[PDB]
Point group: C3
Chain length 368, copies 3
Amino acid sequence: AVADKADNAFMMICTALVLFMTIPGIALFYGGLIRGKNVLSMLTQVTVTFALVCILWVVYGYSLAFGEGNNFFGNINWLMLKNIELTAVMGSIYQYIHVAFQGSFACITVGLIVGALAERIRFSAVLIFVVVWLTLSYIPIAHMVWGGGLLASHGALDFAGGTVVFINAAIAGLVGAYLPHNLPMVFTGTAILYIGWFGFNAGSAGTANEIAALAFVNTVVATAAAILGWIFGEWALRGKPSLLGACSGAIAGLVGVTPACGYIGVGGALIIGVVAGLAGLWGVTMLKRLDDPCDVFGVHGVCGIVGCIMTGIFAASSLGGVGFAEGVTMGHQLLVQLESIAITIVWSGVVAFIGYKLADLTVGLRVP
Amino acid sequence: AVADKADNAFMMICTALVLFMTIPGIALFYGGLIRGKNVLSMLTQVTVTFALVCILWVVYGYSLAFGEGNNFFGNINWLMLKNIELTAVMGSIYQYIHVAFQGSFACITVGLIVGALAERIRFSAVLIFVVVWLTLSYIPIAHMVWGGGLLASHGALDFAGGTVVFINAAIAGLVGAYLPHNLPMVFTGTAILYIGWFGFNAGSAGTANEIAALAFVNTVVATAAAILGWIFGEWALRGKPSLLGACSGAIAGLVGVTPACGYIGVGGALIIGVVAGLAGLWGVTMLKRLDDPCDVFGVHGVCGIVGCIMTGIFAASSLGGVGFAEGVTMGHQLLVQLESIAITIVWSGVVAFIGYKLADLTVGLRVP
Amino acid sequence: AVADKADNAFMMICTALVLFMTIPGIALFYGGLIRGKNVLSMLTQVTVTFALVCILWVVYGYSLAFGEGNNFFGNINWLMLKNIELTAVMGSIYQYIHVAFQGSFACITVGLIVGALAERIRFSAVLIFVVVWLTLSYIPIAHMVWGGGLLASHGALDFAGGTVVFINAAIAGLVGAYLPHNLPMVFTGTAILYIGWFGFNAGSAGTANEIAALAFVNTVVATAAAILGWIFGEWALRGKPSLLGACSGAIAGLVGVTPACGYIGVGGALIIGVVAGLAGLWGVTMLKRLDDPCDVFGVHGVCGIVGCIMTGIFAASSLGGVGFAEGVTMGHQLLVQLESIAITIVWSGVVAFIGYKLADLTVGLRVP
């Protein structure tokens, strides 16, 4: 197996774009939503936990997520990338690039949680939580879905992380919750998220081929459709569109197309986008009957679930998708999508609860 | 014809960079120029019309612009990208990438108009206008210049859209007009525009070859030269440089080098940049004797015209350019540049007028 | 020698990312640190001197830095890129791309100085200074290290410019000095710097190969480690982390890994990051006993020195690096690193002093 330089180039740039989603994307997104007096602290927690995740990833995370192990985790053979030769190839790129690309997904996932909960959680408590939850939730679930584990070996479809990233983070954040002064800044973060998301979705093909291209176009289309879907629902329910509605719409479509983007046709991307924008609206509306920043987990959670379900529909050849695996009916894919979603919800929740409680028992959770 | 992965990678990244020009580039540019109390509304109109253009593009826009038809429009054979095989190649990249790249130019074009006029126009009126003007102006003109239509078949030179994007948008905006509180934000948008513009200009080569490289370097050089040209004129006329002058200079050179970048030598890029920065200054100065945000169409319009004229000069081999087509004197290229510019001005204006009047007759134009 | 399109693509995108570090990265970084009433002026000086450097680079800078000459400068054979054929290849990319990539390093270097000193220096004095110092300091030092000059011909290691960019700029700025109201904005600039830095460090390989990949990953790792190192020192010395501490940490690791990134293992990147974050903290702490914006040269200078020294340690094969050149002991590399650092400090200082004094004698240095 030889590395293709075009894929290497593509995937390093894609990694830079996913890192850009956290630093500064998600930080500016939450920075505009949360209370002014809490912005500096939130930006500090996002920056430090990001650093933390980068280090844990290289030390053991990548190895435990992508080494070969069992159905649930990999191994410790790649501690500090030990035994990965510089010229080792994975797919059609150098494995070092795979390490960085995958680590960038871990970072955005943690960013989604910390940016929202930063306001309410002690600093040392967030560090502890991030260590427990990245290690016992993000990593096994990344392993199950993308590392040849349980869900993969049953043919779950999740191109860029509807489960691993969004449902996973939404549940961890909502357990957290259970336990806007600057809209131009919200818009800027949304914009940075949108752009970085082309690396997230297209780079998820692992190569600059026709699947990256499909994912790119489906990203443009689902995002746009979700913006219109959300804005129309807002105009119908609230009388007029709003900037926050526009940005929330964009996030709803981005998140909804995430598991599907590399499997569906542009027709499907359009339908998924409209449904995700409306379901996102319905979702935050319901969450707002329990404020602001954690309602965002209503978008990530509901849109992730919807997107995951609808991947199992729109991948079908007859609906313009790339087609299910041989011998797989749409019914079977649906069942497998639902099982993947349930395992993620339950796995992430249990580990989140343990994470928050461990922190609470060591340093105390609620910021003093 | 087989896709080259290097070109695929390059052109997906270039597309992400052109999308970044609208979201958030042009939005932040206008956001800093217009009245504080109007910023949220403008950001909403830019976000929603952007979404709108993405959807119209995939549904019929691309097909009508790039399908084969007549001198003025393509066809409806590619409705929702029907009959484009996933692996279809166009040039040396997958056609799906061509769709996304071309659509991103439609988006920035509409962004230029909406960002300026958002303040003064009813929301539903802007949606109607965008539908009419994208469909009857952007698409035929894209078809005439880049889709093998009238102007192309006469050898018009316009590497990245001096006519299709800038003169086209300037005229539509100025008809609109006829019918700064945050300079750090203006600067940020200009900066985002500049960076995204490397994808706009370099990606316009369709491949990561020596023409992309020429376009890249000419972009650096024209922008810089226009900044100095504008700043010197300001120092001479107003006594000192200003930040807005600096940013306006950068836009003047970017817009002026747009039609020329892939055809000229760095010597020509320097000359075009100085002339565009000075003509831009002269232009806004004149427009300011008819405020702020629409004066920007003086830069887009005057610089686009200047850049289009000067492409027909500096493409010449003897002036360091790549050379005119065989059998084409500089005189002939000039005549063809001028004819292209006139057709664009007149075509865009007529359709803009119809667009605004249709809206005015349905929902009413002036924001209530 | 034929151009590889994958390398061409990679290196054009990398160039766009390094330009993004100056416009708007460093501008927003200083914009948040300096006095509110001085922001507009600083943004203007950064934008205009950036333009200035782009023009000088194409006119003679590139030629004098990368043409063949002597140990200290190149030649004037490439004036305005004369005699570089469009299809000329350098390494595995078109030489025009090499011109743009190298010019982008000149730009960020000047940005580091001007962004800090803008507050205190007359506009015309900064233009004069930039002309003298780019020409007699940046160019010879770029030539000595990367253009086959003195330091290169002794085997100095400096992957992406610990000397040419950071120590060089720190000294020029500190001579300048001798002669925060918006932390969200500081954070945004730091974030833009971090992301653009992947082009800076990875593109410094000149190709999308396994060395780019190593540089990418080492960038992620050193940055993150430096953030934790700085934050821990702050928590230990000041009682709690701060946002400015977080951002300063990130810059410390970025700057420290700059000379090393393509030569070291991830283990070394981690160690270099922790040491650079702590040394950066120690450094600004000492500089703050001589305010704010020039203390940043304590990060660039101290971290650059540390990173340069530690390249001569961690490149060793036994410490996971790519290995010293044949026949070179670690001791010898160390001596050569130290000599390179001394020459840079002394060369840049002497030329800075001449630059500032020439300006002072023509227009006067201190802003009126």
